[PDB]
Amino acid sequence: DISSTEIAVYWGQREDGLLRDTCKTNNYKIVFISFLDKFGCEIRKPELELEGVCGPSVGNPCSFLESQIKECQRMGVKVFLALGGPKGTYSACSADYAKDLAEYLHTYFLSERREGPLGKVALDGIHFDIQKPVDELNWDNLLEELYQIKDVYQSTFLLSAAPGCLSPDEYLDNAIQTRHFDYIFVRFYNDRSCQYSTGNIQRIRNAWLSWTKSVYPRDKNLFLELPASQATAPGGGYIPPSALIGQVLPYLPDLQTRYAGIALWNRQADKETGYSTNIIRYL
């Protein structure tokens, strides 16, 4: 129901502050470290670079995040690595590369098997934020290879996706149809055909309905991804906290069986506006 709302947030920019401090707010249940945005056929070992935070150029290694990731996990926060995003050059390449990449993610990010870009860690999941890939092929293969690895090692990591609000999604439909993502974070912004607008929840309510009908299984596996300020969604979609709680959520079909919570585009915007703080106050 509404009271059990789980809040997720994207973190990865200088203005977001420290990961440790983000977790310590206790406002979030899931944090997406964002983004591994450069991979493809000839990139056997993808490197992680967070703008103004870590990587070759900020002269601070991303492996320094290891202890903060573990602190977050110890306090009950799930930390995911998000693939893709708004920028970069990313492609799943081919069926063979999909296996190579799935293995890479498992060995270096999901099992503490080897030292990777974020140190020796075992993240809670992998998030497919495939917004602007080179093309739509092989994302389903990547998901399937990670899913197979999960079975082989009887692992507990989660798999999630962030499609746009217009179904079927241009890039992730084939992957979503496998029914193998644990969570689907629908981006209800930057698309006038399926986002909220002042005094009109019909398009967003209808889009939510389209998603409940096309995503199986019928578990609590759907989240609404929303911008935390008007500035983070130039194409529209921002929903004031009071409107979300009082005018939108109560009117989403199958909220009681399908709704898991909300994801907020981005930590910086949330910090500036107090979005999650106000939502929490009203839950």
Curated annotation (Swiss-Prot):
The keyword Coiled coil does not apply. Keywords: Glycoprotein, Signal. GO terms for molecular function: chitinase activity. Residues 5-283 form the GH18 domain. GO terms for cellular component: extracellular region. GO terms for biological process: carbohydrate metabolic process. It comes from Canavalia ensiformis. This is Concanavalin B. Belongs to the glycosyl hydrolase 18 family. It comes from the Eukaryota. May act as a carbohydrate-binding protein.
